[PDB]
C-alpha cells in the first residue's frame, strides 16, 4: 500500500516501519503452566558419547568437502558451481 523508511514520499504520518518487533513486552506471564522442572546440575563444559556406526564411509577427521578445494594457488579461482 504505502512505503517509506522515514522520508515518506506521500504526505502522511507513515508511522509504520521495521519498528513492529520491539513492543513493550507484557509483564504478566503464566509462570507455571504445568508441573515440571526437575531442576538439577549440568554446568561443567563437557559431553562425550556418540554411537558407533551409522554414517557412510567417511569421517574420522576429514575437514575436506567443499567446491573448489584449491584456493589462492591456481591462475584463477574458477568454480564450476556458484
Amino acid at each position: 500500500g504505502s512505503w517509506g523508511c522515514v522520508r515518506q514520499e506521500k504526505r502522511s504520518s507513515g508511522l509504520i516501519s521495521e519498528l513492529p518487533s520491539e513492543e513493550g513486552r507484557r509483564l504478566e506471564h503464566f509462570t507455571k503452566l504445568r508441573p515440571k522442572r526437575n531442576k538439577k546440575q549440568q554446568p561443567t563444559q563437557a559431553a562425550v558419547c556418540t554411537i558407533s556406526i551409522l554414517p557412510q564411509d567417511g569421517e574420522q577427521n576429514g575437514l575436506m568437502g567443499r567446491v573448489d578445494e584449491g584456493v589462492d594457488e591456481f591462475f584463477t579461482k574458477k568454480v564450476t558451481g556458484c
Binding site: 500500500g1 512505503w3 521495521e18 513492529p20 518487533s21 520491539e22 513492543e23 564450476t80 558451481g81 556458484c82
Partner: protein, 275 residues
C-alpha cells in the same frame, strides 16, 4: 565465553533456518527467547533477507502478475532486487508481505538473448510439473563468463493441518562454446508438526557437460536436461519412500511380538529359563 555478539549470531541462525511457511512463529520464538529487542534488530534485516533469498521466496510486485523469485542473483545490493522477466526494479520490504515502488531497469542486454529464451521455455516446463510453481531465469556476467541461472520454486502451506512443504531447484549454465558445463542443486523440505516434528530434508547436486548450439535450441536442450534430472531425482525419492516403508521401517520394530500375540506380562514378570 559469552557475549551479545554470539547471542545475536545464534538468534540469526535459528531465524534463517525456519521451515517454509513458518518464519514468523520461529521469529517470535527467538524474539521472546533472546529477550532483547535492541540486539534482535542488529541482525534482523540481514536475517529476513537471507531467509527469503535462500528460500526462493515468490513475491508479487505491485501489479505485474509478476510472481518473481527473490534470490541472491537478483539482489541489486542497494536493498532492491531484479525481475529479469518483466525486467523492472523492485524494492522488497522484508517484514511486510509486499514489495513495491518499482524502477525500470534498462539492461546490459548481452546474455539476455539466451536468458529470454530459457526463461519462458522453462516457464513452460514449470507450468507442466509444479502445481503452484514459479520460476526466474537470470542472465548475467560472472567474472568474464556468461551464465544462465534458472531458479524454480514450488510450495504448499497448510498450517491449520500442521504441515508445509517447498521445492527449490537452481541451475547454473556456464557457456563455453562449442559445449558448456552444467551445475545444479535440487532441494526438498517438508514439515509435519501435529503432536510431533517430522521433516524431510533432501537435496541433490548435479554437474553436466552440454553441447551449445543456437538460442531457442540450446534453451530447449536445457529445459530437457532439467526435466530429466528432476524427474530422475523425484523418481529416486518415491523409490526411497517405498524401501523405507517396506524394508527399513519393518526392520526396526515389529507390528506384533515374535510370539505373535500381545505380551503376557504376568509371564514376563516370573517365568524363567532357569533363574
Amino acid at each position: 565465553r559469552v557475549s551479545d555478539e554470539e547471542k545475536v549470531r545464534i538468534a540469526a541462525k535459528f531465524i534463517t533456518h525456519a521451515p517454509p511457511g513458518e518464519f514468523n512463529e520461529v521469529f517470535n520464538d527467538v524474539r521472546l527467547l533472546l529477550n532483547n529487542d535492541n540486539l534482535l534488530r542488529e541482525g534482523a534485516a540481514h536475517a529476513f533477507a537471507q531467509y527469503n533469498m535462500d528460500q526462493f521466496t515468490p513475491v508479487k510486485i505491485e501489479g505485474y502478475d509478476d510472481q518473481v523469485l527473490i534470490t541472491e542473483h537478483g539482489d541489486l545490493g542497494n536493498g532492491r532486487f531484479l525481475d529479469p522477466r518483466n525486467k523492472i526494479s523492485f524494492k522488497f520490504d522484508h517484514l511486510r508481505k509486499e514489495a513495491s515502488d518499482p524502477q525500470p531497469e534498462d539492461t546490459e542486454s548481452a546474455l539476455k538473448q539466451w536468458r529470454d529464451a530459457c526463461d519462458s521455455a522453462l516457464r513452460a516446463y514449470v507450468k507442466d510439473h509444479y502445481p503452484n510453481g514459479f520460476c526466474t531465469v537470470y542472465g548475467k556476467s560472472i567474472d568474464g563468463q556468461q551464465t544462465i541461472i534458472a531458479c524454480i520454486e514450488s510450495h504448499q502451506f497448510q498450517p491449520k493441518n500442521f504441515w508445509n512443504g517447498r521445492w527449490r531447484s537452481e541451475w547454473k549454465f556456464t557457456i563455453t562454446p562449442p559445449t558448456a558445463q552444467v551445475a545444479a542443486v535440487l532441494k526438498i523440505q517438508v514439515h509435519y508438526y501435529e503432536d510431533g516434528n517430522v521433516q524431510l530434508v533432501s537435496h541433490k547436486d548435479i554437474q553436466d557437460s552440454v553441447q551449445v548450439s543456437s538460442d531457442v535450441q540450446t534453451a530447449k536442450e536445457f529445459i530437457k536436461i532439467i526435466e530429466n534430472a528432476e524427474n530422475e531425482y523425484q523418481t529416486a525419492i518415491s523409490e526411497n519412500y517405498q524401501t523405507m516403508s517396506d524394508t527399513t521401517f519393518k526392520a526396526l520394530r515389529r507390528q506384533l511380538p515374535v510370539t505373535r500375540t500381545k505380551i503376557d506380562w504376568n509371564k514376563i514378570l516370573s517365568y524363567k529359563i532357569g533363574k
